[PDB]
Amino acid sequence: IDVLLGADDGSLAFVPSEFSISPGEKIVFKNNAGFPHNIVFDEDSIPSGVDASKISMSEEDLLNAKGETFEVALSNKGEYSFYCSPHQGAGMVGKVTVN
Secondary structure, three states, rough: EEEEOOOOOOOOEEEOOOEEEEOEEEEEEEOOOOEEOOOEEEEEEEEEEOOOOHHOOOOOEEEOOOOOOOEEEEOOOOEEEEEEEHHOOOOEEEEEOOO
């Protein structure tokens, strides 16, 4: 599934922000608008036993250019909360469910 970072009107959102995938389905996060952006999984808000480091950007890492992507595949089932660190307070947050 593709997810935009920034809406086409410049809104600081993931599009989509809430979505479900199957195990080992790839997510491609694509820099769209209002970058730089990143994708961080909340270590307190992912399935038990998952290593956030394996699936997230560092807080300090950025995608700086239009069309840069970060791709990830999730295998454990459950709910995963993520956010964009520089824009978290703006509400640039999301949740994926692996079912």
